[PDB]
């Protein structure tokens, strides 16, 4: 796993733990511990029901923190079934996180701006809000009270006068709490993340079970021009130690090669001599060595399943 992959994983973990409930952490951590993970396997790992995994998968899908992949499977001894797999498409999740972080801060900042504006007015009976400008064209002939249009009743001043400080406090808190996301996004922008696919995710798969019914394989149909929406993403070394006897053998081989090369160029026989008169063409020391060795020895003593396959 590349170092950036850990940064993305940590960003996803922080977002899920801070902005989603408890069961959401379980679902996404399961398919972050593993790569693409079948729905049946996901249910078996967390021991939760379909009616409980539904809301979790649905919300993590709407926010694009999890991607789905449906493919037809043909078990050798069962009816063909359509299996559903869940994985994480990091470019998609990061964009969703970045947009949501920006929007939440922007909404609070705008609320700070709005709450710092004049109050306004409301009618107690019809519960209709009037702005400062709108209320100034309804005041009575005595210039004493603002009268409603539908009810013809005095208006009551609106709230939000005192929140001038609370909204700033809320923004002060959020940026402190949301700090890790901003720090992680900065590091992500520096690097370049590769978009993930079901097949690509399968390369990092940690099998969940011994005998999972789902075949964690991607065998795409042959010559299928059909394109689904959002289903595409952007020697041997041998050594030989040569001994002295091998060296002389190699020299003999080299000499033979030179001799063969010389023959290939030599002229034929008929071109060598003038062939006029010839008929026309047509249809013991070992004992001496031992007695020496004994003699020197005396001296030194004196001094001292059938399928198609290939070969790789």
Partner 1 sequence: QFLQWCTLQPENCAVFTSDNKEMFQTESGLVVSTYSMVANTRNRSHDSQKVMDFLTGREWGFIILDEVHVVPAAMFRRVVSTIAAHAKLGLTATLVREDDKIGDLNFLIGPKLYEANWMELSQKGHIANVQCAEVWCPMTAEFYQEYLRETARKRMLLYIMNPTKFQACQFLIQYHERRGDKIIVFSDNVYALQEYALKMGKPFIYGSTPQQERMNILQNFQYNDQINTIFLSKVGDTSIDLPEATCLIQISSHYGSRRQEAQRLGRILRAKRRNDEGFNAFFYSLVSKDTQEMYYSTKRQAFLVDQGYAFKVITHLHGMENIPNLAYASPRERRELLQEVLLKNHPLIRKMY
Partner 2 sequence: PRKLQDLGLKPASVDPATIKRQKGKITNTHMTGILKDYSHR
Examine residue 257 and tell whether it contacts partner 1 (CB under 8 A).
no
Binds partner 2 by CB under 8 A, chosen from 32, 178, 193, 202: 193
- Which residues fall within 8 angstroms of residue 18, CB to CB, at 6 or more apart? 177
Of the listed pieces 11-19, 152-160, 188-196, 251-259, which binds partner 2 according to CB under 8 A?
188-196
The distance of closest approach from Cβ of residue 159 to Zn ion in the complex, given in angstroms and rounded to an integer, is 17
Examine residue 275 and tell whether it contacts partner 1 (CB under 8 A).
yes
The distance of closest approach from Cβ of residue 256 to partner 1 in the complex, given in angstroms and rounded to an integer, is 17
Q: Which residues between 282 and 311 bind partner 1 (CB under 8 A)?
A: 282-283
Q: Got the DSSP string for the chain?
A: --HHHHHHHHHHHHHHHHHS-HHHHHHHHHHHHSSSEEHHHHHHHHT--HHHHHHHHHHHHHTTSSEEEEEEE--TTS--EEEEEEE--HHHHHHHHHHHHHHHHHHHHHHHHHHTS---EE-TTT--EE-HHHHTTSB-TTSSSBBPSSS--B-EE-S-STTHHHHHHHHHHHHHHTHHHHHHHHHHHHS-PPPP-HHHHHTT----SSS-SS-----PPTT-----TT-------------HHHHHHHHHHHHHHHHHHHHHHS--STTTS--SSSPPP---HHHHHHHHHHHHHHHHHHH---------
Binds partner 2 by CB under 8 A, chosen from 220, 223, 229, 277: 229
Q: What x/- string results for residues 34 through 73 when contact with partner 2 is judged by CB under 8 A?
A: ----------------------------------------
Binds Zn ion by CB under 5 A, chosen from 68, 151, 205, 299: 151
Considering the complex, state which of residue 235 and residue 280 has its C-beta at the smaller distance from partner 1.
280
The distance of closest approach from Cβ of residue 130 to Zn ion in the complex, given in angstroms and rounded to an integer, is 9
- Say which entry of partner 2, Zn ion, partner 1, none residue 92 contacts (CB below 5 to 8 A, set by partner kind): partner 2
The distance of closest approach from Cβ of residue 150 to Zn ion in the complex, given in angstroms and rounded to an integer, is 5
Binds partner 1 by CB under 8 A, chosen from 142, 269, 307, 311: 269
Considering the complex, state which of residue 45 and residue 174 has its C-beta at the smaller distance from partner 2.
174
- Which residues fall within 8 angstroms of residue 20, CB to CB, at 6 or more apart? 59, 60
Contacts to partner 2 by CB under 8 A:
90-92, 94-95, 98-99, 102, 188-189, 193, 195, 227, 229-230, 232-234
The residues that touch Zn ion, with contacts defined as CB under 5 A, are: 123, 125-126, 148, 150-151
Contacts with partner 1 by CB under 8 A lie at 264-271, 275-276, 278-283
């Amino acid at each position: 796993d590349r170092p950036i992959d850990d940064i993305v994983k940590n960003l996803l973990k922080f977002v899920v733990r801070g902005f989603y409930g408890g069961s959401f952490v379980l679902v996404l951590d399961a398919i972050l511990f593993h790569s693409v993970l079948a729905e049946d396997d996901l249910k078996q790992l967390l021991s939760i029901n379909k009616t409980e995994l539904g809301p979790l998968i649905a919300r993590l899908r709407s926010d694009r923190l999890i991607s789905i992949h449906k493919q037809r499977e043909y078990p050798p001894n069962s009816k063909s079934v359509e299996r559903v797999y869940y994985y994480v498409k990091y470019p998609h999740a990061i964009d969703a996180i970045k947009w949501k972080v920006h929007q939440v801060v922007q909404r609070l900042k705008d609320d700070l701006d709005k709450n710092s504006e004049p109050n306004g007015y409301m009618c107690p009976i019809c519960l209709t809000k009037y702005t400062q400008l709108e209320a100034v064209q309804l005041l009575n002939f005595d210039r004493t009270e603002f009268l409603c249009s539908l009810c013809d009743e005095p208006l009551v001043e609106d709230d939000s006068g005192k929140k001038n400080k609370e909204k700033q406090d809320k923004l002060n808190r959020l940026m402190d709490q949301i700090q890790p996301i901003i720090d992680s996004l900065k590091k992500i922008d520096d690097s370049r993340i590769e978009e993930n696919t079901f097949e690509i995710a399968l390369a990092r798969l940690i099998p969940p079970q011994n005998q999972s019914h789902a075949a964690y394989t991607y065998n795409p149909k042959k010559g299928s021009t059909m394109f689904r929406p959002g289903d595409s993403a952007p020697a041997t070394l041998h050594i030989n130690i040569t001994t002295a006897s091998d060296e002389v053998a190699q020299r003999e081989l080299q000499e033979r090669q030179a001799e063969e090369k010389r023959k290939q160029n030599a002229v034929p026989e008929w071109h060598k001599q003038s062939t006029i008169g010839k008929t026309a063409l047509g249809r013991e020391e070992r004992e001496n060595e031992k007695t020496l060795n004994d003699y020197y020895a005396a001296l030194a003593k004196k001094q001292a399943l059938e399928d198609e396959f290939e070969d790789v």
